[PDB]
């Protein structure tokens, strides 16, 4: 199926709250954590703890201490560029995806106060800037050709190799399938209106397709889609509703299901 690896950084100036937090994920699973309070990088998944020796955690604890310091300075510089005082946020997201079809994606992005600031394009080796402050930064970063090449290599080769390594460590969790339990609920709501709800729960992975069809064909009417939500036990739940021959169609991990009303 599709899998992803991503590392986030969050920097907060003058916090109420850690000044710096970094979290890693594989798919929807936290794998690693570091903050300016613990000053230690730690596993967040037991399959990460069991497969990476103490030297991995010791080395990355040092790297994260260094990155924490640089993040603080970069945020001070951004505030000075914007003439901003008080508390502001700086975020980074790096990562890659290995798609089921075999294709790969790689991404590296920054945000200031929760909005896109700089987006790296690894195919053109350039940074897309949202405003004149981001442009000043883009010019400074793009002057270092070796760093752009290094980032392209990391996204395309290193990130994918780390992802495949973690996917194997966490295979019993990440590569399992828990099929959905699906039901259809019918209810007369406002007088003369009938609502049909197709509800699914207990599934893993969270990715699920749900739709309503009329006489074996795609509807013209509006379907309301429930969010895919964590149930708290490692599984997920979702729904789709319509108002009014109707049938609910569910696709999950290569299996199709139809519930005719």
């Amino acid at each position: 199926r599709t899998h992803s690896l991503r590392y986030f950084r969050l920097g907060v100036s003058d916090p109420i709250v850690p000044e710096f937090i970094s979290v890693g994920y594989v798919d929807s699973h936290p794998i690693t954590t570091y903050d300016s309070v613990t000053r230690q990088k730690e596993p967040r998944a037991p399959w990460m703890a069991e497969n990476l020796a103490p030297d991995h955690w010791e080395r990355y604890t040092q790297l994260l201490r260094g990155w924490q310091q640089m993040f603080k300075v970069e945020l001070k510089r951004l505030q000075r560029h914007y003439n901003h005082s008080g508390s502001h946020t700086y975020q980074r997201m790096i990562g890659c995806e290995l798609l089921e079809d075999g294709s790969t994606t790689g991404f590296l992005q920054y945000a200031y106060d929760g909005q896109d600031f700089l987006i790296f394009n690894k195919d053109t080796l350039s940074w897309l800037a949202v405003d004149n402050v981001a442009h000043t930064i883009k010019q400074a970063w793009e002057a270092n050709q070796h760093e752009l090449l290094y980032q392209k290599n990391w996204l395309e080769e290193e990130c994918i190799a780390w992802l495949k390594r973690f996917l194997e460590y966490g295979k019993d969790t990440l590569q399992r399938t828990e099929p959905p339990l699906v039901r259809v609920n019918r209810k007369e709501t406002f007088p003369g209106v009938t609502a049909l709800f197709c509800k699914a729960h207990g599934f893993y992975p969270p990715e699920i397709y749900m739709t309503w069809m009329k006489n074996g064909e795609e509807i013209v009417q509006e379907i309301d889609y429930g969010d895919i939500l964590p149930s708290g036990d490692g599984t997920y739940q979702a729904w789709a509703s319509i108002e009014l021959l109707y049938s609910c169609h569910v696709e999950h991990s290569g299996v199709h299901m139809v519930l005719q009303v």
Epitope: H56, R59, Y60, Q62, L63, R65, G66, W67, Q69, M70, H146, E147, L149, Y150, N153, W154, E157, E158, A161, W162
Partner: antibody
């Protein structure tokens, strides 16, 4: 993890020399060359991370990622090129693995 | 650049020694290496940024202090003949492959 480069090479003044370096690293984040004259500090010469040849004056540095191979090419050799050339690979954890160096001797 | 001292030092076995290293390039990372014939540079200790240090490949018989952003000192608490070597301090802007800038080197000879 291992970096392999010849112990010593000898070439003639005015000619060309290619110093090979093979790396067997746990992941790859770049390949560096440094120059170190006798009794002096090493100084940065080059960095390669993607495939290709990068030219800087009389010196060129090549990388083949699929072969895990690099070379440092020195053209129009001068007596001042007599030095040790250090190859260093960066692994997945951004740590350098330093080669034992190639001592380059130039014949006048 | 990187300023390291002393250039030369003779020590008797058991004596203490501190090597000094400073850089005014606003670099975050600093390193102490030993260079011996027939082998690649070996990292003793490093400092990823001000406020942190960690062991390299050969930390036994040494300790370090990242005094401030500029300074990274190397100490030999009880000099041993095996510590006869050429020591190099280096610094880099960051931790991800920015070029290393080296000090002049310190030639230490430990004698009984």
């Amino acid at each position: 993890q291992n970096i392999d480069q010849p112990t010593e090479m000898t070439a003639t003044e005015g000619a060309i020399v290619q110093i090979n370096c093979t790396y067997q690293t746990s992941g790859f984040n770049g390949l560096f060359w440094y120059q170190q004259h006798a009794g002096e500090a090493p100084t940065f010469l080059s960095y390669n991370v993607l495939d290709g040849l990068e030219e800087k004056g009389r010196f060129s540095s090549f990388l083949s990622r699929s072969k895990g191979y690099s070379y440092l090419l020195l053209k129009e050799l001068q007596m001042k090129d007599s030095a040790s050339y250090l190859c260093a690979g960066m692994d997945s954890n951004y740590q350098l693995i330093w080669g034992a160096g190639t001592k380059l001797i130039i014949k006048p | 650049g990187v300023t390291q001292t002393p250039k030369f030092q003779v020590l008797k076995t058991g004596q203490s020694m501190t090597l000094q290293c400073a850089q005014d390039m606003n670099h975050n990372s600093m390193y102490w290496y030993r260079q011996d014939p027939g082998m690649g540079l070996r990292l003793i200790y490093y400092s990823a940024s001000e406020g942190t240090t960690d062991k390299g490949e050969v930390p036994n018989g040494y300790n370090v202090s990242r005094l401030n952003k500029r300074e990274f000192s190397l100490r030999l608490e009880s000099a041993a003949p095996s510590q006869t070597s050429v020591y190099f301090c280096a610094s880099t802007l960051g931790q991800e492959g920015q070029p290393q800038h080296f000090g002049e080197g310190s030639r230490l000879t430990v004698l009984e």
